[PDB]
C-alpha cells in the first residue's frame, strides 16, 4: 500500500490515485514575492476553548491526535472561509534531519516539520461527506523549526513511546491544541488537496506565516516512531512528507502586508 519509500512513495501515488496529477494538489511552494495581499481576507477565528481530544493513533504514516467532532466544540471560521469548520484531528509531517520535513515550503525553504489541524465544513454533516466537496475541509498548517522547546507539545511527545508501531493507539484526553499555535495568525491561503491518499481536492489551505519552535529533543522523539507494525522489521517513521506540487492555475493570497 502507499507510503513514503522508494517503491511506494509520492512519485508512485498517481497509479492508485490519479488525482495526484490534478489541478489543485497540495502541498505547494509559497513564493512570498508573488503571493498578493488581499485586504478582503478576514482575521482567522480559531475557537479551541472547548476542544475535546480523545485519542492518539499511529496509523502507519503519522500519528493522529483525534477530537470529538460530534458538536461545535473546536471550530475554525473567518479568514478566507464561509461558514464553520469543526476540528477532527491534527497530525504532523517531519524529516530525518532538521533541514527537511515540511510539506509546504516558503521561497523553497523546508522547515523541520509541519502540523496540520484538519477541520470539516459543518454544512456537509460529516467528514466523509465533506471530503467530496471542493470547500469541504479547512486545514490550518503550521511550520515547526528547531530551537526552543514548545511546552504545549511535550504531552504529545510524552505519549509516543506507547504508540511506537502502526495500529497502536492510546487515550489522549484533555489535550489543548491552543498550545501548538504561534503568536501571530497571519496566513497565506490557496485551494488545494489532502496531502496523503486519497489526495482529494477538498481543502482550503490556511498556512500560518509564523513557525513554532520545538526542541531538537522533541523532534528526535517523533523520529523514533515506526512505520511498521509490532514485531515487524523496524523502519523509522521519518520523511513522511509529500514534496511541493505544481501550482497550476492558482493564486496564493496573503492576509498581511
- Burial class of residue 1, CB neighbours in 10 A (0-12, 13-18, 19+): exposed
In degrees rounded to 5, what are phi and psi of residue 61?
A: -120, -50
Kindly state the greatest CA–CA separation across the chain.
54
Q: Quote the DSSP letter at residue 61.
A: S
In terms of phi and psi (left: phi > 0; alpha: psi -120 to 50; beta: otherwise), the region of 248 is left
The catalytically annotated residue of 7, 33, 61, 119 is 61
Across the strands, what pairs with 65? 56, 90
State yes or no: 116 annotated in a binding site.
yes
Is there a contact between 95 and 241 (Cβ–Cβ < 8 Å)?
yes
Which experimental approach was used here?
A: X-ray
Reference 58, options 198, 222, 196, 231; nearest CA is 222
Reference 102, options 146, 162, 137, 132; nearest CA is 146
Domain boundaries, the chain: 1-257
C-alpha cell at 199: 489526495
State yes or no: 14 annotated in a binding site.
no
Q: Per the omega criterion (within 30 degrees of 0), is the bond before 153 cis?
A: no
Beta pairing class for 63-67 and 29-30: unpaired
* CATH number assigned to the domain covering 1-257: 3.10.200.10
What is the C-alpha to C-alpha distance for residues 93 and 251, in angstroms, rounded to an integer? 24
Documented resolution in Å? 1.2
Cite the DSSP H helix spans in 95-234: 127-130, 154-159, 216-222
State yes or no: 196 annotated in a binding site.
yes
What is the C-alpha to C-alpha distance for residues 247 and 195, in angstroms, rounded to an integer? 14
Count of helix runs (H) and strand runs (E) in the chain: 4, 15
Is 7 labeled as catalytic in the residue annotation? Answer: no
Handedness of CA 245, 246, 248, 251 (dihedral sign): positive
Amino acid at each position: 500500500h502507499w507510503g513514503y519509500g522508494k517503491h511506494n512513495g509520492p512519485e508512485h501515488w498517481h497509479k492508485d490515485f490519479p488525482i495526484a496529477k490534478g489541478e489543485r494538489q497540495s502541498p505547494v511552494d509559497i513564493d512570498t514575492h508573488t503571493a498578493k495581499y488581499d485586504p478582503s481576507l478576514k482575521p482567522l477565528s480559531v475557537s479551541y476553548d472547548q476542544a475535546t481530544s480523545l485519542r492518539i493513533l499511529n496509523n502507519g504514516h503519522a500519528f493522529n491526535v483525534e477530537f470529538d467532532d460530534s458538536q461545535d466544540k473546536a471550530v475554525l471560521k473567518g479568514g478566507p472561509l464561509d461558514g464553520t469548520y469543526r476540528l477532527i484531528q491534527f497530525h504532523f509531517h517531519w524529516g530525518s534531519l532538521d533541514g527537511q520535513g515540511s510539506e509546504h515550503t516558503v521561497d523553497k525553504k523546508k522547515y523541520a516539520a509541519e502540523l496540520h489541524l484538519v477541520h470539516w465544513n459543518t454544512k456537509y454533516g460529516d467528514f466523509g461527506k465533506a471530503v467530496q466537496q471542493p470547500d469541504g475541509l479547512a486545514v490550518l498548517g503550521i511550520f515547526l523549526k528547531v530551537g526552543s522547546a514548545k511546552p504545549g507539545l511535550q504531552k504529545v511527545v510524552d505519549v509516543l513511546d506507547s504508540i511506537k508501531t502502526k495500529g497502536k493507539s492510546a487515550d489522549f484526553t484533555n489535550f489543548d491544541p491552543r498550545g501548538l499555535l504561534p503568536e501571530s495568525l497571519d496566513y497565506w491561503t490557496y485551494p488545494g488537496s489532502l496531502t496523503t491518499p486519497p489526495l482529494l481536492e477538498c481543502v482550503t489551505w490556511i498556512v500560518l506565516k509564523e513557525p513554532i519552535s520545538v526542541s531538537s529533543e522533541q523532534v528526535l522523539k517523533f523520529r523514533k516512531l515506526n512505520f511498521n507494525g509490532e514485531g515487524e522489521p523496524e523502519e523509522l517513521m521519518v520523511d513522511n512528507w509529500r514534496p511541493a506540487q505544481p501550482l497550476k492555475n492558482r493564486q496564493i493570497k496573503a492576509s498581511f502586508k
